Structure formats: structure tokens, C-alpha cells
Enzyme design. Structure first.
Site, PDB file in Angstrom:
ATOM      1  N   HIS A  74       1.409   2.979  -7.884  1.00 56.58           N
ATOM      2  CA  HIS A  74       0.938   1.581  -7.721  1.00 56.58           C
ATOM      3  C   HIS A  74      -0.490   1.477  -7.208  1.00 56.58           C
ATOM      4  CE1 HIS A  74       2.434   1.294  -3.405  1.00 56.58           C
ATOM      5  NE2 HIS A  74       1.466   0.396  -3.323  1.00 56.58           N
ATOM      6  N   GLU A 130     -11.975  11.611   6.745  1.00 59.54           N
ATOM      7  CA  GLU A 130     -12.269  10.290   7.326  1.00 59.54           C
ATOM      8  C   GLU A 130     -11.538  10.058   8.617  1.00 59.54           C
ATOM      9  OE1 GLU A 130     -14.392   8.234   6.711  1.00 59.54           O
ATOM     10  OE2 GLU A 130     -14.743   7.822   4.570  1.00 59.54           O
ATOM     11  N   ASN A 180     -13.048   6.851  11.116  1.00 57.64           N
ATOM     12  CA  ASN A 180     -13.561   5.506  10.863  1.00 57.64           C
ATOM     13  C   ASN A 180     -14.019   5.382   9.415  1.00 57.64           C
ATOM     14  OD1 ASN A 180     -15.178   3.058  10.786  1.00 57.64           O
ATOM     15  ND2 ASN A 180     -15.190   3.168  13.058  1.00 57.64           N
ATOM     16  N   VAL A 188     -17.806   3.984   8.940  1.00 58.94           N
ATOM     17  CA  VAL A 188     -18.922   4.678   9.545  1.00 58.94           C
ATOM     18  C   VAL A 188     -18.998   6.115   9.028  1.00 58.94           C
ATOM     19  CG1 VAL A 188     -19.993   5.459  11.754  1.00 58.94           C
ATOM     20  CG2 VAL A 188     -18.712   3.340  11.705  1.00 58.94           C
ATOM     21  N   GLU A 239     -16.933  13.799   6.594  1.00 61.79           N
ATOM     22  CA  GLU A 239     -16.460  13.293   5.290  1.00 61.79           C
ATOM     23  C   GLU A 239     -16.864  14.167   4.110  1.00 61.79           C
ATOM     24  OE1 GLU A 239     -18.471  11.486   7.433  1.00 61.79           O
ATOM     25  OE2 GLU A 239     -17.381   9.639   7.917  1.00 61.79           O
ATOM     26  N   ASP A 275       7.277   6.146  -8.043  1.00 60.75           N
ATOM     27  CA  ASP A 275       5.965   5.664  -7.544  1.00 60.75           C
ATOM     28  C   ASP A 275       5.129   6.833  -7.026  1.00 60.75           C
ATOM     29  OD1 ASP A 275       3.841   4.068  -6.875  1.00 60.75           O
ATOM     30  OD2 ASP A 275       4.762   3.087  -5.155  1.00 60.75           O
ATOM     31  N   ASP A 324       6.530   0.241  11.396  1.00 60.52           N
ATOM     32  CA  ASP A 324       6.616   0.403   9.921  1.00 60.52           C
ATOM     33  C   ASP A 324       5.254   0.743   9.318  1.00 60.52           C
ATOM     34  OD1 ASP A 324       8.043  -1.896   7.342  1.00 60.52           O
ATOM     35  OD2 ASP A 324       7.853   0.310   7.332  1.00 60.52           O
ATOM     36  N   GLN A 346       0.989  -2.917   3.953  1.00 60.71           N
ATOM     37  CA  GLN A 346      -0.066  -3.043   2.930  1.00 60.71           C
ATOM     38  C   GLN A 346      -1.296  -2.249   3.338  1.00 60.71           C
ATOM     39  OE1 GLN A 346      -0.968  -7.405   2.256  1.00 60.71           O
ATOM     40  NE2 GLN A 346      -0.692  -6.623   0.160  1.00 60.71           N
ATOM     41  N   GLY A 347      -1.862  -1.483   2.412  1.00 60.77           N
ATOM     42  CA  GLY A 347      -3.035  -0.674   2.723  1.00 60.77           C
ATOM     43  C   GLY A 347      -2.697   0.752   3.127  1.00 60.77           C
ATOM     44  N   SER A 403      -0.280   2.172   1.463  1.00 60.30           N
ATOM     45  CA  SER A 403       0.223   2.625   0.154  1.00 60.30           C
ATOM     46  C   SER A 403      -0.382   3.951  -0.309  1.00 60.30           C
ATOM     47  CB  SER A 403      -0.086   1.566  -0.910  1.00 60.30           C
ATOM     48  OG  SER A 403       0.726   0.421  -0.696  1.00 60.30           O
ATOM     49  N   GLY A 404       0.475   4.857  -0.762  1.00 54.71           N
ATOM     50  CA  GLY A 404      -0.002   6.089  -1.338  1.00 54.71           C
ATOM     51  C   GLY A 404      -0.150   7.214  -0.313  1.00 54.71           C
TER      52      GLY A 404
HETATM   53  N1  LIG Z   1      11.943  -7.146  -6.388  1.00 54.37           N
HETATM   54  C1  LIG Z   1      11.546  -5.862  -6.168  1.00 54.37           C
HETATM   55  N2  LIG Z   1      12.349  -4.825  -6.445  1.00 54.37           N
HETATM   56  N3  LIG Z   1      10.345  -5.647  -5.627  1.00 54.37           N
HETATM   57  C2  LIG Z   1       9.740  -4.331  -5.310  1.00 54.37           C
HETATM   58  C3  LIG Z   1       8.367  -4.646  -4.686  1.00 54.37           C
HETATM   59  C4  LIG Z   1       8.519  -5.415  -3.375  1.00 54.37           C
HETATM   60  C5  LIG Z   1       7.148  -5.707  -2.726  1.00 54.37           C
HETATM   61  N4  LIG Z   1       7.497  -6.340  -1.451  1.00 54.37           N
HETATM   62  S1  LIG Z   1       6.312  -7.099  -0.647  1.00 54.37           S
HETATM   63  O1  LIG Z   1       5.582  -8.061  -1.538  1.00 54.37           O
HETATM   64  O2  LIG Z   1       7.049  -7.768   0.452  1.00 54.37           O
HETATM   65  C6  LIG Z   1       5.062  -5.940   0.054  1.00 54.37           C
HETATM   66  C7  LIG Z   1       4.141  -6.666   1.055  1.00 54.37           C
HETATM   67  C8  LIG Z   1       3.116  -7.496   0.587  1.00 54.37           C
HETATM   68  C9  LIG Z   1       2.298  -8.172   1.495  1.00 54.37           C
HETATM   69  C10 LIG Z   1       2.512  -8.028   2.878  1.00 54.37           C
HETATM   70  C11 LIG Z   1       3.546  -7.201   3.341  1.00 54.37           C
HETATM   71  C12 LIG Z   1       4.352  -6.524   2.424  1.00 54.37           C
HETATM   72  C13 LIG Z   1       6.334  -4.411  -2.498  1.00 54.37           C
HETATM   73  O3  LIG Z   1       6.563  -3.665  -1.538  1.00 54.37           O
HETATM   74  N5  LIG Z   1       5.349  -4.232  -3.377  1.00 54.37           N
HETATM   75  C14 LIG Z   1       4.411  -3.090  -3.443  1.00 54.37           C
HETATM   76  C15 LIG Z   1       3.618  -3.044  -2.121  1.00 54.37           C
HETATM   77  O4  LIG Z   1       3.142  -4.085  -1.654  1.00 54.37           O
HETATM   78  N6  LIG Z   1       3.540  -1.861  -1.515  1.00 54.37           N
HETATM   79  C16 LIG Z   1       2.784  -1.729  -0.219  1.00 54.37           C
HETATM   80  C17 LIG Z   1       3.742  -1.623   0.972  1.00 54.37           C
HETATM   81  C18 LIG Z   1       3.658  -0.528   1.827  1.00 54.37           C
HETATM   82  C19 LIG Z   1       4.530  -0.424   2.914  1.00 54.37           C
HETATM   83  C20 LIG Z   1       5.488  -1.412   3.172  1.00 54.37           C
HETATM   84  C21 LIG Z   1       6.356  -1.258   4.271  1.00 54.37           C
HETATM   85  N7  LIG Z   1       6.875  -2.303   4.898  1.00 54.37           N
HETATM   86  N8  LIG Z   1       6.764  -0.053   4.652  1.00 54.37           N
HETATM   87  C22 LIG Z   1       5.578  -2.524   2.317  1.00 54.37           C
HETATM   88  C23 LIG Z   1       4.691  -2.623   1.232  1.00 54.37           C
HETATM   89 CA   LIG Z   2     -16.149   7.748   8.053  1.00 54.51          CA
END
Ligand SMILES: N=C(N)NCCC[C@@H](NS(=O)(=O)Cc1ccccc1)C(=O)NCC(=O)NCc1ccc(C(=N)N)cc1
Ligand SMILES: [Ca+2]
Ligand SMILES: [Cl-]
Length: 223
Positions: free
Chosen positions: A40, A52, A54, A57, A62, A84, A171, A174-175, A177-178
Site C-alpha cells: 500500500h 535517519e 530526525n 534535519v 543518512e 500487503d 499502537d 498512519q505514516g 505504514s510499511g
Molecule cells: N474494510 C476493510 N477491510 N478495510 C481495510 C482497510 C482499513 C483502513 N482503516 S483506517 O481507514 O481506519 C486507517 C486509518 C486512517 C486514518 C487514521 C487512522 C487510521 C486501513 O487501515 N487502511 C490502510 C491504512 O490506512 N494503513 C495505515 C495504518 C497503519 C497502522 C494502523 C494501526 N492502527 N495499527 C492503522 C492504519
Molecule cells: Ca535526518
């Protein structure tokens, strides 16, 4: 990362930032030429940033390296987030050192209860928006599939696991990811998906890397 702590500069030396004009995803360095991230996170024009702390900066440790090839998993499903995972090949080999280091792939899958280290530069707030400049860390256990499913009502495929705290407060977000989920020195997870962040009964969902080791190895052998 919500409810985590400041890692400390270069304490997670396999942690990568993917930059497309700004940080947008994490990744894990698995050898001098390849990074594992989330499918994703795919986009054109990725620059991989190693060493990395900061992200805003230049601190002196880096290495910025362009991607030469990106390989999204063949079976990635952008609706369910099944499979994913993505490989990124670096245009040039990273210079490995104490602050830029590879992380091993699993020999076998981890089990429920095992403690893991999850890291990234994602949102630190469960409500609202705050993006750190330095790398954040969280210790979190893998949850059993059954307890996760009953608590959340999520569909968890064979290629996913839940990790974190059903009570909320801690937890990935967002951000992040990956980015890595490392357990006993093995990359067992990739930050994938969830429902909000750090909410009760809504734990983090992670790509189960142990199922992809054969794919990673044969892909690297032929690319
Ligand atoms: N109906 C189905 N099966 N949907 C699958 C996708 C669900 C989607 N959920 S979501 O939109 O709540 C993710 C999110 C977006 C904005 C702010 C906080 C969290 C989601 O997670 N989308 C991809 C994404 O946003 N990934 C980033 C991410 C990373 C970590 C977490 C976490 N809570 N561990 C959640 C999202
Ligand atoms: Ca840096
Ligand atoms: Cl189970």
C-alpha cells in the site's frame, strides 16, 4: 506510533523512511540492496532514506538512495490488504555500518505472546494529528488470531497477524505504514492496516512476513 517512546538516534538501524518529497512510509533494510515495505506504500519516484533519526534535519548519518525497481506482491489486494508487501531494490548498494544495518528474515513464524518492536514516524495521537520529527518505538505482543477476531470483528487472513493491546492507548498509526515489527531479531511483521489507532478492541494488523520469505528470496535471486 501512539503511546510509544523516542527510540534514540539510529537505535533501529534497519528502519527506512520512504520519501516522495516528504516522508510517507517506513520500510526495513533486509540486505545492502533491498528494502521490504507495504504494498500500500507503492508509488512512483521513491527515494529510500537510511540512517535517519530526525527526518527534517541532515544529522550526518543518512544515505539517500533512489529505488531502481519496485515489486508489489503478485497477490496484493488493495481492498482487504491481503499480501500487503513490496520489495524495493536500491539503485546503489547501501554502505552498511553501525547506523545502517540489515535485519534478518524469519526462519519460522512467531507465536501469540511474543514481544516485538514496532517503529516509525507516523502519527503519535489517537485523536487529532501530530507527526514526530524523530523515530518512535513501541513494544507490543502478538495477539492470538481468535482473541483478535472476537475482540475486533476483523477478517484476519493467514497472511496477517494482530499485535498490540486490546485496552487501547498503544499502537502503530498512519505514516508508520510499511515499517518493521521485529521479534527476537527477525522481521516478522510489516505495518499494514487497522481501524483508527490505539482504540479499544481494535489492535494493529501486520503483514505476516514469515509467509513471504520464499517469495523474497527467489525475487532477490532473479532481480
Ligand atoms: N474494510 C476493510 N477491510 N478495510 C481495510 C482497510 C482499513 C483502513 N482503516 S483506517 O481507514 O481506519 C486507517 C486509518 C486512517 C486514518 C487514521 C487512522 C487510521 C486501513 O487501515 N487502511 C490502510 C491504512 O490506512 N494503513 C495505515 C495504518 C497503519 C497502522 C494502523 C494501526 N492502527 N495499527 C492503522 C492504519
Ligand atoms: Ca535526518
Ligand atoms: Cl488463535
Amino acid at each position: 506510533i501512539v503511546g510509544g517512546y523516542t527510540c534514540g538516534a539510529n537505535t533501529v538501524p534497519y528502519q527506512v523512511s520512504l520519501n516522495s518529497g516528504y516522508h510517507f512510509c517506513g520500510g526495513s533494510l533486509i540486505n545492502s540492496q533491498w528494502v521490504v515495505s507495504a504494498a500500500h506504500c507503492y508509488k512512483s519516484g521513491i527515494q529510500v532514506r537510511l540512517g535517519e533519526d530526525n527526518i527534517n534535519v541532515v544529522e550526518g548519518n543518512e544515505q539517500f538512495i533512489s529505488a531502481s525497481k519496485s515489486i508489489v506482491h503478485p497477490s496484493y489486494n488493495s481492498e482487504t490488504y491481503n499480501n500487503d508487501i513490496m520489495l524495493i531494490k536500491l539503485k546503489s548498494a547501501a554502505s552498511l555500518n553501525s547506523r545502517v544495518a540489515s535485519i534478518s528474515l524469519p526462519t519460522s513464524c512467531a507465536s501469540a505472546g511474543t514481544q516485538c518492536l514496532i517503529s516509525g514516524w507516523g502519527n503519535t495521537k489517537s485523536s487529532g494529528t501530530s507527526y514526530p520529527d524523530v523515530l518512535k518505538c513501541l513494544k507490543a505482543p502478538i495477539l492470538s488470531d481468535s482473541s483478535c477476531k472476537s475482540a475486533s470483528s476483523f477478517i484476519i487472513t493467514s497472511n496477517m497477524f494482530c499485535a498490540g493491546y486490546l485496552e487501547g492507548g498503544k499502537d502503530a498509526c498512519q505514516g508508520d505504514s510499511g515499517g518493521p515489527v521485529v521479534c527476537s531479531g527477525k522481521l516478522q511483521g510489516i505495518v499494514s492496516w487497522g481501524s483508527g489507532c490505539a482504540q479499544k478492541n481494535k489492535p494493529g494488523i501486520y503483514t505476516k512476513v514469515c509467509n513471504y520469505v520464499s517469495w523474497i528470496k527467489q525475487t532477490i535471486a532473479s532481480n
